[PDB]
């Protein structure tokens, strides 16, 4: 147990390894109602409901274990974040970690043994708007304080407002999420 003490929410570069292992249970934080944002499995189920109403090949013996292969193989790699005193600690199943400040995007050494103590109890958020694209956006499409706070919080309102403002730095990320929702 890295952190305060044994939780079983944090059970385990060593850092990258630990973070991927913790994110394979942050998927369960996602499907345990302990999230705040677009809750990636929700996008997966929306893709499922948008595909199985169009696909001609749907049948009684057929949908069973297709629902499960979907739930299992939609978005295999997926990242999460936790906010504490205006300092975001990210993490991903792909072994990547990013610490950064909300107002002024600039990286920081990733504080392990604190990220765990925080992600354990504090709410988690999903990486629909992940740091890479977030910084590309803050660079090219200059961003306001409230819009940035809402994008950190993963608000569907501001998300759809950008998607209607035709921001390729978000359209590309959403297309990547689709192409990962492939089966």
């Amino acid at each position: 147990s890295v952190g305060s003490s044994a939780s079983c929410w944090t059970d385990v570069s060593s850092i990258s390894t630990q973070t991927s292992t913790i994110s394979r249970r942050l998927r369960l934080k996602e499907m345990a109602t302990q999230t705040e944002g677009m809750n990636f499995d929700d996008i997966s189920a929306a893709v499922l409901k948008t595909k199985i109403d169009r696909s001609t090949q749907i049948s009684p013996n057929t949908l069973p274990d297709i629902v499960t292969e979907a739930s299992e193989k939609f978005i295999p790699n997926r990242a999460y974040r936790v906010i504490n005193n205006d300092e975001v600690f990210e993490a991903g199943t792909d072994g990547r970690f990013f610490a950064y400040r909300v107002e002024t995007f600039d990286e920081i050494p990733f504080d392990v043994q604190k990220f765990a103590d925080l992600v354990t109890d504090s709410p988690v958020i999903s990486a629909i708007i992940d740091f890479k694209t977030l910084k590309n956006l803050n660079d090219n499409y200059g961003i306001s304080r409230q819009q940035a706070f809402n994008l950190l919080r993963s608000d569907p309102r501001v998300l759809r407002e950008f998607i209607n403002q035709d921001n390729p730095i978000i359209r590309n990320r959403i297309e990547q999420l689709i192409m990962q929702c492939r089966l």
Binding site: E30, M31, D41, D42, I43, A46, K49, S71
Partner: peptide
Amino acid sequence: MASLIYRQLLTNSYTV
């Protein structure tokens, strides 16, 4: 919500 459907499937597992 769209994950609540999975949680509801799990909840109603007893009906299987």
